[PDB]
Design an enzyme around this catalytic site. Structure first.
Site, PDB file in Angstrom:
ATOM      1  N   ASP A   1       0.820  -1.202   0.000  1.00 51.78           N
ATOM      2  CA  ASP A   1       0.000   0.000   0.000  1.00 51.78           C
ATOM      3  C   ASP A   1       0.861   1.262   0.000  1.00 51.78           C
ATOM      4  O   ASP A   1       1.868   1.351   0.712  1.00 51.78           O
ATOM      5  CB  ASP A   1      -0.897  -0.011   1.244  1.00 51.78           C
ATOM      6  CG  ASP A   1      -1.759   1.226   1.353  1.00 51.78           C
ATOM      7  OD1 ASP A   1      -2.705   1.350   0.539  1.00 51.78           O
ATOM      8  OD2 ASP A   1      -1.497   2.074   2.241  1.00 51.78           O
TER       9      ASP A   1
ATOM     10  N   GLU B   1       1.662  -0.392  -5.008  1.00 49.53           N
ATOM     11  CA  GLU B   1       0.633   0.541  -5.431  1.00 49.53           C
ATOM     12  C   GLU B   1       1.286   1.884  -5.675  1.00 49.53           C
ATOM     13  O   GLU B   1       1.667   2.568  -4.718  1.00 49.53           O
ATOM     14  CB  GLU B   1      -0.481   0.711  -4.405  1.00 49.53           C
ATOM     15  CG  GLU B   1      -1.572   1.630  -4.934  1.00 49.53           C
ATOM     16  CD  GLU B   1      -2.066   2.671  -3.931  1.00 49.53           C
ATOM     17  OE1 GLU B   1      -1.457   2.812  -2.873  1.00 49.53           O
ATOM     18  OE2 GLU B   1      -3.085   3.346  -4.204  1.00 49.53           O
TER      19      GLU B   1
END
Ligand SMILES: C[C@H]1O[C@H](O[C@H]2[C@H](O)[C@@H](O)[C@@H](O)O[C@@H]2CO)[C@H](O)[C@@H](O)[C@@H]1N[C@H]1C=C(CO)[C@@H](O[C@H]2O[C@H](CO)[C@@H](O[C@H]3O[C@H](CO)[C@@H](O)[C@H](O)[C@H]3O)[C@H](O)[C@H]2O)[C@H](O)[C@H]1O
Ligand SMILES: C[C@H]1O[C@H](O[C@H]2[C@H](O)[C@@H](O)[C@@H](O[C@H]3[C@H](O)[C@@H](O)[C@@H](O)O[C@@H]3CO)O[C@@H]2CO)[C@H](O)[C@@H](O)[C@@H]1N[C@H]1C=C(CO)[C@@H](O)[C@H](O)[C@H]1O
Ligand SMILES: C[C@H]1O[C@H](O[C@H]2[C@H](O)[C@@H](O)[C@@H](O[C@H]3[C@H](O)[C@@H](O)[C@@H](O)O[C@@H]3CO)O[C@@H]2CO)[C@H](O)[C@@H](O)[C@@H]1N[C@H]1C=C(CO)[C@@H](O)[C@H](O)[C@H]1O
Ligand SMILES: C[C@H]1O[C@H](O[C@H]2[C@H](O)[C@@H](O)CO[C@@H]2CO)[C@H](O)[C@@H](O)[C@@H]1N[C@H]1C=C(CO)[C@@H](O)[C@H](O)[C@H]1O
Ligand SMILES: [Ca+2]
Ligand SMILES: [Cl-]
Ligand SMILES: [Cl-]
Length: 448
Positions: free
Chosen positions: A174, A200
């Site tokens: 993330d 990400e």
């Protein structure tokens, strides 16, 4: 054979486990991306999952034993688990986590203020011209960990290695843009083995930080893919998609995680052009293209109807609700079970030995067909007329299940839905209704 994973967004561990047994294993999905399983702040909004409090495996999805049970039950039927991993930050403010721990003022069960970058605020302008602020300041007030610190790297690595030890096979990193690629490199050196890692990084161009900086540390989310695919499907011509991929400025196919939408951008977080379940058959068709086309590692999105509240958590009815499946209506949407989408997965799963586009055909606008050599063939009709062209393939002549509408019987004698005929000369006389499609492959062929 396995080629596609699915984000079971806010599904709890028991629903994931049952879903692996009853659908994902049988339909050939490679893996499930689960919502963060570590301890996070209390509250029912979906975004509480992105505010860590510790690395104990007690979360909204369930406790540690339930997590392990899910990993095991999914693995038993050939489905891996990828964990959404919070490498950049901890919760903002002060409060309580889902395992009962307290936190406040950059003090947590395993971190103290020295383990964080000095507080500052990532401002909108910083994305364009301040790499330093993007990676050392706070994303919407979240405590920004000192990811250059050896203690921080060791603590995150221990969480990753605990999850590997219990069977987790991959990780979504993330907010990877907010961590210097060199910090991620140092982290990975403490990570056991070589699990699947995708980072990400939202990079549509024109920013200080580039998705290309992350290619050496793992796979990378290619957000250009869904953004451009949605623009084409809404306003452009499918015919333009004949060289989709690196020719459109995308990263290398073997580095990319691709998807039509994700949990942020189906709400307008992190694109008015993004397609979602709300677009119905337009979403079907875009997924069929994605899954048939040989670019990237695709992630199918699996959502809930949030009734207009982009902050709300998921339905408080489980998916598997005492014998009734709470899919397809105003609770869980279960896009991964939609016929065209799961059929696209079967097609990708059985055309993976031929990563080329062959015999591309189009009508200069919104009707297309192409092949994966002799391993499969497909066509999309996104116009209001019926598509009856005759198209060339490399398929063996014979009769094939349209895997978007049915499947081959165990005896291989019949299809449960429409049957497509490949002629002696390898052609197909298409007969595709408006806003419909077809896909066939060599392992879904009627056998004499
Ligand atoms: C949501 C994404 O935000 C950034 O994306 C930027 C792009 O990088 C930039 O190119 C351009 O497009 O702008 C966007 C900014 O809008 C990050 O780079 C990207 O990583 C991020 N996606 C992932 C990471 C986060 C953070 O863990 C997830 O965020 C969600 O959770 C947070 C925290 O709970 C939530 O914020 C809430 O808390 C704050 C206070 O802490 C309050 O303002 C409010 O109560 C809540 O909004 C976010 O809403 C939510 O998006 C994200 O889901 C990951 O996928
Ligand atoms: C399943 C696999 O699909 C995708 O991989 C394909 C690449 O995208 C294609 O580019 C092509 O890779 C070739 C390279 O182009 C070429 O440069 C050379 O390196 O050879 C490569 C292999 O032929 O074909 C690949 C398919 O073979 C996707 O990118 C890739 O991530 C996918 N694999 C993931 C899925 C599973 C699920 O079990 C895991 O085992 C893998 O670790 C994941 O990475
Ligand atoms: C869950 C379901 O979602 C999908 O269908 C949506 C259609 O794309 C929309 O067009 C709309 O359908 C309307 C028709 O257009 C209209 O002609 C009329 O019949 O009303 C329909 C409903 O209002 O809405 C649909 C969703 O409500 C998706 O395309 C479809 O494939 C999905 N169906 C799955 C669900 C069932 C139920 O068990 C399965 O039998 C199917 O195999 C799945 O595909
Ligand atoms: C265990 C602590 O390690 C680190 O402190 C180091 C610091 O890096 C340098 O000053 C070198 O020496 C100190 C002492 O080792 C972390 O910076 C520190 O946050 C750690 N403490 C946290 C962890 C534990 C348990 O994991 C808790 O007991 C403690 O309350 C918590 O703050
Ligand atoms: Ca950071
Ligand atoms: Cl734990
Ligand atoms: Cl993502």
């Amino acid at each position: 054979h396995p080629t596609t994973f699915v984000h079971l967004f806010e599904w709890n561990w028991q629903d994931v486990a049952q879903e692996c047994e009853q659908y994902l294993g049988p339909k050939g999905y490679a893996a499930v991306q689960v919502s963060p399983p570590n301890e996070h702040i209390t509250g029912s909004q979906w975004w509480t999952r992105y505010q860590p409090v510790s690395y104990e495996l007690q979360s909204r999805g369930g406790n540690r034993a339930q997590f392990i049970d899910m990993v095991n039950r999914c693995s038993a039927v050939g489905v891996d688990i990828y964990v959404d991993t919070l490498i950049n930050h901890m919760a903002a403010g002060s409060g309580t986590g889902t395992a009962g721990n307290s936190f406040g003022n950059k003090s947590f069960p395993i971190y103290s203020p020295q383990d964080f970058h000095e507080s500052c605020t990532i401002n909108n302008s910083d994305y364009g011209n301040d790499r330093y602020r993007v990676q050392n300041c706070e994303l919407v007030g979240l405590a920004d960990l000192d990811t250059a610190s050896n203690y921080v790297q060791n603590t995150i690595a221990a969480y990753i290695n605990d999850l590997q030890a219990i069977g987790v096979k991959g990780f979504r990193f993330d907010a990877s843009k907010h961590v210097a690629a060199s910090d991620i490199q140092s982290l990975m050196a403490k990570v056991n083995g070589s699990p699947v890692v995708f980072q990400e990084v939202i990079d549509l161009g024109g920013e200080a930080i580039k998705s290309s900086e992350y290619l050496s540390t793992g796979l990378v989310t290619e957000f250009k893919y869904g953004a451009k695919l949605g623009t084409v499907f809404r306003n452009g011509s499918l015919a333009w998609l004949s060289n989709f991929g690196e020719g459109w400025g995308f990263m290398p196919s073997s580095s990319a995680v691709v998807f039509v939408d994700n949990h942020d951008n189906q709400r307008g977080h992190g694109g008015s052009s993004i397609l979602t379940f709300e677009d119905g058959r337009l979403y079907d068709l875009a997924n069929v293209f994605m899954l048939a086309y040989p670019y990237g590692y695709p992630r199918v999105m699996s959502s809930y109807d949030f009734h207009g509240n982009d902050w709300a958590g998921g339905p408080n009815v489980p998916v598997h609700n005492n014998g009734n499946l709470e899919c397809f209506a105003s609770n869980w949407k279960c896009e991964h079970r939609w016929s065209y989408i799961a059929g696209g997965v079967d097609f990708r799963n059985n055309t993976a030995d031929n990563w080329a586009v062959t015999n591309w055909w189009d009508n200069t606008n919104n009707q297309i067909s192409f092949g994966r050599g002799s391993s499969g063939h497909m066509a999309i009709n996104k116009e209001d007329s019926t598509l009856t062209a005759t198209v060339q393939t490399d398929m063996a002549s014979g009769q094939y299940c349209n895997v978007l509408k049915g499947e081959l019987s165990a005896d291989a004698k019949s299809c449960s839905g429409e049957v497509i005929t490949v002629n002696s000369d390898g052609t197909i006389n298409l007969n595709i209704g408006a806003w419909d499609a077809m896909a066939i492959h060599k392992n879904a062929k009627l056998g004499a």
